[PDB]
Amino acid sequence: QNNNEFKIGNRSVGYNHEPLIICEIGINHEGSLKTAFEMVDAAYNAGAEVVKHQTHIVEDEMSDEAKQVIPGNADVSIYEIMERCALNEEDEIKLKEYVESKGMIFISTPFSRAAALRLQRMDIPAYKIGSGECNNYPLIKLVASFGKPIILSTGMNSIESIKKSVEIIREAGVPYALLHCTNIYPTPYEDVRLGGMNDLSEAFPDAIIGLSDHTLDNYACLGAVALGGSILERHFTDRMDRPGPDIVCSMNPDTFKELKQGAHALKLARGGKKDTIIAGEKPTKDFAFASVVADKDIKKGELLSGDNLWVKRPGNGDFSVNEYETLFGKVAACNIRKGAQIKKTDIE
Template identity: 40%
Template sequence: MKPTTGQAEEEGVIIIAEAGVNHNGSIAMALSLVEKAKQAGADFIKFQAYIPGEMVVQGESQYRMLESLALGEKEFLLIREKCAEEKIPFLASVFDEKSLALMEKLNAPAIKIPSGEITNLPLIKKAAATGRPLILSTGMSTLGEVEAAVLAAEEAGNKKIALLHCVSEYPAPLEKTNLRTIKTLQAAFRYPVGFSDHTEGYDAALLAVALGARIIEKHFTLAKNLPGPDHKLSLTPGEFREFIEKIRSAGEALGTGRKTVTAGEKAVRAAAGKSLVARVDIAKGSVLSPDLLALKRPGTGIPPQYLPLVAKARAARFLPKDSLLQWSDFILEGKGENEAGNETENNRLN
């Protein structure tokens, strides 16, 4: 499964369990998140890869918090092993070049560029140069900044790109989610588009799927009451399982877009559709004028759209009132009786 090229619509939406920093710096919690994400049915689990000193000025208040939540190479090796054991691929958002190099070393199947790095074109170019698929989150950015990021990746020779619409508020109010941006991104860039969901609940993600989102990313935690910046807006394992079920159902409901008669509709169509019938007793040789014909259920005979054609024919035999007409019951203008009978095969309902 390739998270950036998008699956065929029939295969469904890719769902990423965003563990982020909800491991609270504990490798045991990180491994438990992997296990629970797999059990919930997620396609991928994603963490955050960063080196505090490469990411934040040490004097900043967030430095200490980020330092306590950072995972190093040793921890990511254990996560990769656990993901292999559970058969769920892992991803990581990269915030600096050293973390990008680590993800390449660990053979991550794709590189995630978080919203805060969307204008970090040097990082995007280096990520693109790895040749791995890129997932670009677009929170806190303008369309022009997204365009610059996409061009940077393309100039580095990488067109395996997916874009995630995102509103970087925690939580993001539903009324500010602006989900029509998904269509804007689809039209502007012709790459698969998904949704990184920071809202509470399921509604925004379900609407995103209806708008064509091919990837859904949602925060995931072991418990909402744990200390940390993202637990409260995240889904618990039970909630995430229910969330995935709803996303899968929404994807199935969207279907393929091809307008056809379903197998179940065929029986209903036979009962509820209408056919050409004799309105009165019709003598052999009579011209089947419209006043001699009616349209009635069931829909197992000649469909109503053939009324203009049949109304020009002559009855090949006596037709009793309310009998469903068959193609062999009349002779079309200019055709012999045998030719008229062949219409039965040529005009059979699908």
Template identity: 35%
Template sequence: MSVFIIAEAGVNHNGSIDIAKEMVDNAKEAGADCIKFQTFIAENLVSKNAEKAEYQKKQTDSNENQLDMLKKLELSFDEFIELNEYCKHKNIEFLSTAFDLDSIDFLMKLDMKRWKIPSGEITNLPYLIKIAKTGKPIILSTGMSTMDEIKETVKVLKENGCGNITLLHCTTEYPTPYKNVNLRAMNTIQDETKMPIGYSDHTKGIEVSIAAVAMGAIVIEKHFTMDKNMEGPDHKASLEPNELKAMVKAIRNIELALGNGVKIPAESEIKNMKITRKSIMASNCINKGEVFTEENLTVKRPGNGISSMMWFEVLGQTAIKNFKEDELIEL
């Protein structure tokens, strides 16, 4: 199964439908399977007094609160309808994360193939139940979560009608320092839950996503932006289009390289076996009837004669003809 690559546009469109469409174009060009946005009604998502996270304060107007910031990053429901149609036209899957119950109701009308639940909603019981009852597949990010919380959320989703769940290991920090990635936890999640796993990457580069695929991730989610220097909370922790394209290419190469796990000679290397392996041959002239010994035999390339693994079976036998130096031994 091919790795499902989600190009996370998030709110990096900065509230512009035109930038959002440009991001669709670039995600498609990069080879991503899906582009994901964030759907919310700011007043339903945060209170008037909610402060911004530290990383948000660094990248946005320090005088505004979280509600003011999110209002500037909103797209209307009508704009999401337009984006969904645009994605269909471009032949790339549209996906958007709902951040409130009204947004879930709206996105249900767009007939998305799956839901993406963000890390911040993993303890939002009414939200989890509402999404689970749709019966659609769910991709769940697990940032900030303990193993017990993950198991409890999976239980809630299953009990309310969702049996197709993929869990993404994630560190909710933008950007995530490499020392805080703890990528091995991805496999711990799989071992503990017996569920498919992936990785939602908030690091600056592409290395960790590539490593996650090598470790078994079947879903990769990565933020991207048209320009890291744009104002907004997530741009600095996002890839630019050329970097996104490089990541997708690297992941596809790793997929090919992983293979099926069966250890046999690859088709491309069979032709090299005779050249690089060795055969038993005469180390000097050997006369017919002479006994083969360690003094008159040697092992050299090419490997198109008697295998050197037959060394002890050949020793002590009698030469059936004269052999010149470096001539392959025949029995």
């Protein structure tokens, strides 16, 4: 595929590295630092490498109009949901310390100028930009000016619209990833369109490519790895009985571990070339390929033909099945017994 790569802290990402699973706790903590810690613990104990937050400062994120619009996966205004689940600056700092105290990488998605500036003050190692902000060129300009790598979700946006955000990122000179994404909560399998990842890599040859997913299980992400994806993001919860509008499409510790194991296998199995010679097949080639044999008793002086020659395993005969027709018309230099492999000494 490609050899693009960059570092998030000490963790390299890209086609030639192990796929990175981003555990998006998001708003799943419902505004409780204690709940967030329980989810951070569950992620740690499951083997997570990265916990991602969402940084919500509602007054800079939304105008008063947001109090009258309802998301497809809720029954109250987006403003109410965000004001309910937002952690304040003091608590988010503690959350980052807690994640890092567990040896994991902390990143977050700013949904506003104020949030981006908060995260720059905390000095996070990379920035996630959500699909809603993929076309927020002013906010992308700000985040790119921080000089850290950017992971950009691309849901709800065309290649043409994405080109403008990538132009800004390239101008700031930071490496970046593009996550294919579909922003329906939850997303039907039929809307995932894994082919969109190929479209992104074709259009943006310098991007690390991955998938942000909101389906009900791991299949989409496993397919993303088979296609060459390097970053996988799903929401994460410690328990599936938690309340919250994103819980239903979340992984838990057990399904995280399943994704991690499947991503490892598919990282190994993906790519490569048909024509590569595999040493381990040699014993099979040696017995499974066919050699030319006599199909009847052939007397000295008789001509070899398609009527007195055939081919049978194994592959150690003087003439392989690929040389079958070249023997036609040759002269038997001695009697040849039916069923015997044709020897170089059998022909004149």
